[PDB]
Enzyme design. Structure first.
Site, PDB file in Angstrom:
ATOM      1  N   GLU A  85      -5.260  -5.536  -8.540  1.00  0.00           N
ATOM      2  CA  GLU A  85      -5.667  -4.753  -7.380  1.00  0.00           C
ATOM      3  C   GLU A  85      -6.317  -5.680  -6.365  1.00  0.00           C
ATOM      4  OE1 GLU A  85      -8.175  -1.483  -8.313  1.00  0.00           O
ATOM      5  OE2 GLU A  85      -6.700  -0.462  -9.580  1.00  0.00           O
ATOM      6  N   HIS A  99       0.856  -1.178   0.000  1.00  0.00           N
ATOM      7  CA  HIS A  99       0.000   0.000   0.000  1.00  0.00           C
ATOM      8  C   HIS A  99       0.894   1.229   0.000  1.00  0.00           C
ATOM      9  CE1 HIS A  99      -3.830   2.194   0.676  1.00  0.00           C
ATOM     10  NE2 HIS A  99      -3.027   3.072   1.249  1.00  0.00           N
ATOM     11  N   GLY A 100       0.679   2.117  -0.962  1.00  0.00           N
ATOM     12  CA  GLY A 100       1.531   3.279  -1.085  1.00  0.00           C
ATOM     13  C   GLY A 100       0.771   4.556  -1.352  1.00  0.00           C
ATOM     14  N   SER A 101       1.039   5.576  -0.545  1.00  0.00           N
ATOM     15  CA  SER A 101       0.489   6.903  -0.755  1.00  0.00           C
ATOM     16  C   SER A 101       1.605   7.910  -0.531  1.00  0.00           C
ATOM     17  CB  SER A 101      -0.705   7.167   0.173  1.00  0.00           C
ATOM     18  OG  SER A 101      -1.331   8.397  -0.144  1.00  0.00           O
ATOM     19  N   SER A 104       1.497   0.211  -6.613  1.00  0.00           N
ATOM     20  CA  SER A 104       1.340   0.885  -5.330  1.00  0.00           C
ATOM     21  C   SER A 104       2.318   2.044  -5.190  1.00  0.00           C
ATOM     22  CB  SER A 104       1.530  -0.109  -4.185  1.00  0.00           C
ATOM     23  OG  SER A 104       1.357   0.522  -2.929  1.00  0.00           O
ATOM     24  N   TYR A 158       1.555   5.628  -6.606  1.00  0.00           N
ATOM     25  CA  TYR A 158       0.717   6.516  -5.814  1.00  0.00           C
ATOM     26  C   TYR A 158       1.510   7.356  -4.821  1.00  0.00           C
ATOM     27  CZ  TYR A 158      -3.123   3.717  -7.660  1.00  0.00           C
ATOM     28  OH  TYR A 158      -4.013   3.081  -8.493  1.00  0.00           O
ATOM     29  N   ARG A 175      -7.128   3.586   6.787  1.00  0.00           N
ATOM     30  CA  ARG A 175      -8.515   4.009   6.877  1.00  0.00           C
ATOM     31  C   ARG A 175      -9.222   3.754   5.553  1.00  0.00           C
ATOM     32  NH1 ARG A 175      -4.890   7.450   8.209  1.00  0.00           N
ATOM     33  NH2 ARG A 175      -5.151   8.538   6.213  1.00  0.00           N
TER      34      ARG A 175
HETATM   35  N1  LIG Z   1      -1.991   2.605  -2.986  1.00  0.00           N
HETATM   36  C1  LIG Z   1      -2.336   1.334  -3.153  1.00  0.00           C
HETATM   37  O1  LIG Z   1      -2.058   0.462  -2.339  1.00  0.00           O
HETATM   38  C2  LIG Z   1      -3.100   0.975  -4.385  1.00  0.00           C
HETATM   39  C3  LIG Z   1      -2.766  -0.151  -5.142  1.00  0.00           C
HETATM   40  C4  LIG Z   1      -3.500  -0.504  -6.270  1.00  0.00           C
HETATM   41  C5  LIG Z   1      -4.590   0.252  -6.679  1.00  0.00           C
HETATM   42  C6  LIG Z   1      -4.917   1.369  -5.924  1.00  0.00           C
HETATM   43  N2  LIG Z   1      -5.926   2.302  -6.041  1.00  0.00           N
HETATM   44  C7  LIG Z   1      -5.786   3.172  -5.006  1.00  0.00           C
HETATM   45  C8  LIG Z   1      -6.699   4.291  -4.777  1.00  0.00           C
HETATM   46  C9  LIG Z   1      -7.141   5.059  -5.842  1.00  0.00           C
HETATM   47  C10 LIG Z   1      -7.985   6.131  -5.632  1.00  0.00           C
HETATM   48  C11 LIG Z   1      -8.409   6.461  -4.355  1.00  0.00           C
HETATM   49  C12 LIG Z   1      -9.256   7.685  -4.267  1.00  0.00           C
HETATM   50  O2  LIG Z   1      -9.019   8.567  -3.446  1.00  0.00           O
HETATM   51  N3  LIG Z   1     -10.254   7.779  -5.147  1.00  0.00           N
HETATM   52  C13 LIG Z   1     -10.865   9.063  -5.441  1.00  0.00           C
HETATM   53  C14 LIG Z   1     -12.033   8.939  -6.381  1.00  0.00           C
HETATM   54  C15 LIG Z   1     -12.776  10.226  -6.459  1.00  0.00           C
HETATM   55  N4  LIG Z   1     -13.148  10.831  -7.570  1.00  0.00           N
HETATM   56  C16 LIG Z   1     -13.746  12.016  -7.145  1.00  0.00           C
HETATM   57  C17 LIG Z   1     -14.340  13.046  -7.868  1.00  0.00           C
HETATM   58  C18 LIG Z   1     -14.899  14.109  -7.171  1.00  0.00           C
HETATM   59  C19 LIG Z   1     -14.857  14.158  -5.782  1.00  0.00           C
HETATM   60  C20 LIG Z   1     -14.259  13.143  -5.053  1.00  0.00           C
HETATM   61  C21 LIG Z   1     -13.713  12.079  -5.755  1.00  0.00           C
HETATM   62  N5  LIG Z   1     -13.088  10.925  -5.344  1.00  0.00           N
HETATM   63  C22 LIG Z   1      -7.977   5.684  -3.285  1.00  0.00           C
HETATM   64  C23 LIG Z   1      -7.130   4.613  -3.493  1.00  0.00           C
HETATM   65  N6  LIG Z   1      -4.747   2.883  -4.235  1.00  0.00           N
HETATM   66  C24 LIG Z   1      -4.194   1.742  -4.796  1.00  0.00           C
END
Ligand SMILES: NC(=O)c1cccc2nc(-c3ccc(C(=O)NCCc4nc5ccccc5[nH]4)cc3)[nH]c12
Ligand SMILES: [Zn+2]
Ligand SMILES: [Zn+2]
Lengths: 227, 475
Positions: free
Chosen positions: B443, B317-319, B359, B362, B333
């Site tokens: 995923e 998991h990567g941010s 990951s 991101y 979370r």
């Molecule tokens: N880091 C990993 O481990 C990881 C690994 C593989 C796939 C992954 N996808 C995510 C991911 C993507 C997106 C989000 C995310 O905030 N969506 C936002 C979608 C969205 N549109 C919007 C448009 C308008 C307003 C609000 C909105 N939110 C969270 C996690 N993390 C991944």
DNA sequence: CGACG
DNA sequence: CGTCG
């Protein structure tokens, strides 16, 4: 879409506008043309005004005054036919269009004959009361006041919009709603056959109506031939 | 607060403050129907020393020089405040002390803008990690930065950005359905009045384009998590000993231990990273700097219900590193219930990846930030309800604990190992044969925050294969 | 937007 | 208030 339409034409709302060429003031109630330009003082267009002659002195190639000028179809038919010329200066369908245009001419001359006696006999507050008494919306400006009075008397007292309930007004191409659906947006509903009731003149404006000789010749708003 | 320079009195006068309130209004006005992107800054300025007051007004369009200003020296503070309040009224329609602001048509809208010797005895790699994740310097680089295009009027407050994010949730749910063009027009009006954008003389656009909507939402979530990690960055006012290293180390409620690089688990992690680093779609090599076995307080016990659940796996998991602090303080979370669900590929829930490349993408580590962070997590993927094409969902199928988006590229299934009875997919990129799919790399997603158990935290170095590495790679 | 009759 | 810049 309005599309701004930088070329613009109308009667002088006031005698304060200065011609951008000769610098002389443009008298009130005088045919005048302007171009809408983005001012550097605020985020809002503004009209650079010219005398009718001074406007064409500075050189313009207006190929379609009706479509490219906002308010062209809102003038007198004579001043129209003057601008139409000064701008550049079938077998049966031909006569059909010619006769319908003759009807347009009759309607324009009729509306102006109306407005003449309208303001000649009535005061501004009287026009305001006339508009009030027909569920209308009192506009800003004597010119717009008389415009809406003529509209309501000719084509019937306009009724509230179907969505926002705000009164709509006649534009160059069709009737546009001036209401505000929400505090953030304006209603863009546009139609050529809005719902209306019949105009009403109180007993106050009964002898005055006779002075106007209200013909009550029912008709329908002719809309531009363009498309 | 600040002092607009068009007055030129920033060095000669400061903005006024009375009754707690401050006299610097930043009213906006956006009308896409016509293309009006107007602003209005209104200030009441008091000389640094003497009792001399001015009312400063400035108006025009956003970003452009179109507009003007005017300074009017006032007689006294009394008349000055009278004029200031009546101007606020004339412009925005509401009063200065209007607790509940009620928008009126053809009127502006105010915008909230935010302003304002010991020694630690801990292992050193952890102290470096802390200096990185609690890097106040980069936090200020994020929030307190110019970048006129992003903030053409100023650094908006947290509540402003959160309201914009909620309105974007509405925009997303309108894009999903066949909403009326007028509803989306109003959405655009409100979202652009709330957040100014330098569009020059170009008419501000509509939010019809879904991809740009998700991009602006990414921006808003970035700024939001930034301000949140900043609020977590502060809060200390005691235990003035052992360097702030211990302070911000204990602010996480986590037990962090630098896994010996030469250890077995470290070697297996390095092999995982090596094999699963698909340089394809990743113009950067990865170097494993440091390993950290983390035991998050409480998460250890809340994961016991699934400790026996079969099909447990270690995933990536990567941010952004900026969030990692909070991610360690509160654990992984899930998006809030009120956030939009259409943007998420497979709905809200913890996301994971068996390919470290995806990951890592991101972390958004830039050329100027070659160091990134990523987390290894023992997630007990009960039963993988597989989904090839994207699909937003709500109901977990009967007897299914997790979703698996299938991509043609997968870690070699043969190359896997049972570490602590947990499957580690440290194989190289093989062609899974999965066809008629949307994903590139797989995923892995769960829908229960207790189903996850963060085991290791990897400090990674994103050696971007640039001219530097290019010279190092040919001699 | 502000300025003026 | 309603024009013009
Ligand atoms: N880091 C990993 O481990 C990881 C690994 C593989 C796939 C992954 N996808 C995510 C991911 C993507 C997106 C989000 C995310 O905030 N969506 C936002 C979608 C969205 N549109 C919007 C448009 C308008 C307003 C609000 C909105 N939110 C969270 C996690 N993390 C991944
Ligand atoms: Zn002239
Ligand atoms: Zn309407």
């Amino acid at each position: 879409e309005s599309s701004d339409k930088l070329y613009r034409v109308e009667y002088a709302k006031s005698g304060r506008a200065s011609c951008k060429k000769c610098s002389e003031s443009i008298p009130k109630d005088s045919l005048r043309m302007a171009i809408m330009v983005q001012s550097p003082m605020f985020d809002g267009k503004v009209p650079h005004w010219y005398h009718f002659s001074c406007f064409w002195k500075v050189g313009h190639s207006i190929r379609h005054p009706d479509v490219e000028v906002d308010g062209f179809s809102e003038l007198r038919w004579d001043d129209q036919q003057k601008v139409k010329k000064t701008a550049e200066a079938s077998k049966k369908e031909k006569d059909k269009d010619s006769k319908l245009e003759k009807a347009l001419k009759a309607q324009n001359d009729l509306i102006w004959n109306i407005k003449d006696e309208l303001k000649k006999v009535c005061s501004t507050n009287d026009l305001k009361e006339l508009l009030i008494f027909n569920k209308q919306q009192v506009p800003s400006g004597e010119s717009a006041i008389l415009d809406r009075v003529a509209d309501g008397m000719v084509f019937g007292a306009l009724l509230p919009c179907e969505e926002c309930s705000g009164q709509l007004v006649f534009k160059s191409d069709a009737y546009y709603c001036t209401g505000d659906v929400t505090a953030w947006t304006k209603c863009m509903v546009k139609t050529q056959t809005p719902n209306r009731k019949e105009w009403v003149t109180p007993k106050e404006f009964r002898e005055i109506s006779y002075l106007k000789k209200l013909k009550v010749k029912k008709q329908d708003r002719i809309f531009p031939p363009e498309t | 607060a600040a002092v607009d320079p068009d007055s030129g009195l920033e060095h000669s006068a400061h903005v006024l403050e009375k009754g707690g309130k401050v006299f610097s209004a930043t009213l906006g006005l956006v009308d896409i129907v016509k293309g009006t992107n107007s602003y209005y800054k209104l200030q009441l300025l008091e000389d640094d020393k003497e009792n001399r007051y001015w009312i400063f007004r400035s108006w025009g369009r956003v970003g452009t020089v179109i507009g003007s200003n005017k300074l009017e020296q006032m007689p006294s503070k009394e008349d000055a405040i009278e004029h200031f309040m009546k101007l606020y009224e004339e412009k925005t329609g509401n009063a200065w002390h209007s607790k509940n602001f009620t928008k009126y048509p053809k009127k502006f809208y105010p915008l909230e803008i935010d302003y304002g010797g010991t020694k630690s005895k801990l292992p050193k790699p952890v102290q470096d990690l802390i200096k990185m994740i609690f890097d106040v310097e980069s936090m200020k680089k994020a929030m307190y930065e110019i970048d006129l295009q992003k903030m053409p009027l100023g650094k908006l407050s947290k509540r402003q950005i959160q309201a914009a994010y909620s309105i974007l949730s509405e925009v997303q749910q309108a894009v999903s359905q066949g909403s009326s063009d007028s509803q989306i027009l109003d959405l655009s009006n409100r979202f652009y009045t709330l957040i100014p954008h330098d569009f020059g003389m170009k008419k501000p656009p509509l939010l019809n384009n879904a991809d740009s909507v998700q991009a602006k939402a990414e921006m808003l979530d970035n700024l939001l998590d930034i301000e949140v990690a900043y609020s977590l960055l502060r809060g200390g006012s005691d235990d003035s000993s052992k360097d702030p290293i211990d302070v911000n180390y204990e602010k996480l409620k986590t037990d962090i231990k630098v896994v010996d690089r030469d250890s077995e688990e470290a070697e297996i992690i390095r092999k995982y990273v090596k094999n699963t680093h698909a340089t394809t779609h990743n113009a950067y090599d990865l170097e494993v700097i440091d390993i950290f076995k983390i035991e998050r307080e409480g998460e250890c016990q809340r994961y016991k219900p699934f400790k026996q659940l079969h099909n447990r796996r270690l995933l990536w998991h990567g941010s952004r590193t900026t969030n990692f602090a909070g991610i360690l303080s509160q654990g992984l979370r899930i998006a809030p219930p009120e956030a939009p669900v259409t943007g998420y590929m497979f709905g809200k829930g913890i996301y994971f990846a068996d390919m470290v490349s995806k990951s890592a993408n991101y972390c958004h580590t830039s050329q100027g930030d070659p160091i990134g962070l990523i987390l290894l997590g023992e997630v007990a993927l009960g039963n993988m309800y597989e989904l090839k094409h994207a699909s937003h969902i709500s109901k977990l199928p009967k007897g299914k604990h997790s979703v698996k988006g299938l991509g043609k590229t997968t870690p070699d299934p043969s190359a896997n190992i049972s570490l602590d009875g947990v499957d580690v997919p440290l194989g190289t990129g093989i062609s899974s044969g999965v066809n008629d799919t949307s994903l590139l790399y797989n995923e892995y997603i769960v829908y229960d925050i207790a189903q996850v158990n963060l085991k290791y935290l990897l400090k990674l170095k994103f050696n971007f294969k640039t001219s530097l590495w290019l010279e190092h790679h040919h001699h």
